[PDB]
Amino acid sequence: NRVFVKYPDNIQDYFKQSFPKGYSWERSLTFEDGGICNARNDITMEGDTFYNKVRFYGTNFPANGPVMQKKTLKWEPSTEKMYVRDGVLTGDIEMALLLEGNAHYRCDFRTTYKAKEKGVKLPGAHFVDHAIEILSHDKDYNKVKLYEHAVAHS
């Protein structure tokens, strides 16, 4: 949820300007070994609470690969490029998962973001730096505590 970004005063904040009605995003994750995920979130707001309706579908992950074998460690901090693509606010990023055994597993992301209200002004092209990390978890990841920090610039 890109509403949780520190936007400076000289960049238009599409995400905070999308409320109270909300916005939605649609994302493709394409991994180096052919794994592919499609993810989407509908984000609304009621009072002080953001509500998220999330769907996640992944396929074509090799049985012997690091995703099905549970060999990942963390995502590396990275920078999303925000720009208008065919009239829709779009973010592209090249992300990387650290694996066991001094290796990385790369993934391209494209996300489109759509304000629910017509007439929300599209921003100029900029960047969003972020880092995401699991702070704690159960042995089988039945319970996970997650944290993210993000800042927009340029």
């Binding site: 949820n1 509403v3 949780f4 970004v5 520190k6 905070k16 409320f19 109270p20 994302r27 994750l29 995920c37 993810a39 979130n41 707001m45 002080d48 609470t49 953001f50 509500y51 998220n52 309706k53 999330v54 769907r55 996640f56 579908y57 992944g58 396929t59 992950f61 690091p66 995703v67 099905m68 549970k70 060999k71 990942t72 460690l73 963390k74 995502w75 992300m95 998962l97 992301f109 995401i132 699991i134 702070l135 978890h137 089988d140 990841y141 039945n142 319970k143 996970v144 505590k145 997650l146 944290y147 993210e148 920090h149 993000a150 800042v151």
Partner: protein
């Protein structure tokens, strides 16, 4: 302008979440409860698998979708 800049987006806000889906045919439901500071660019969430656990794949592939 005369408008409350934070009429909608407050300095401290809560988060609720439900995720449904499947990876390589393995289905799951995961709930989330969290808090964040929009103008600081920070958020934290406690996630719990409600169906399909223990997940047979890397939890990390899900985390940017919360």
């Amino acid at each position: 302008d005369d408008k409350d800049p934070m009429s909608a987006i407050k300095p401290d806000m809560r988060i609720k979440l439900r995720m449904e889906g499947n990876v390589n045919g393995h289905h799951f439901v995961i709930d989330g409860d969290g808090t964040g500071k929009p103008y600081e660019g920070k958020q934290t969430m406690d996630l719990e698998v409600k169906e399909g656990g223990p997940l047979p794949f890397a939890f990390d592939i899900l985390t940017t979708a919360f």
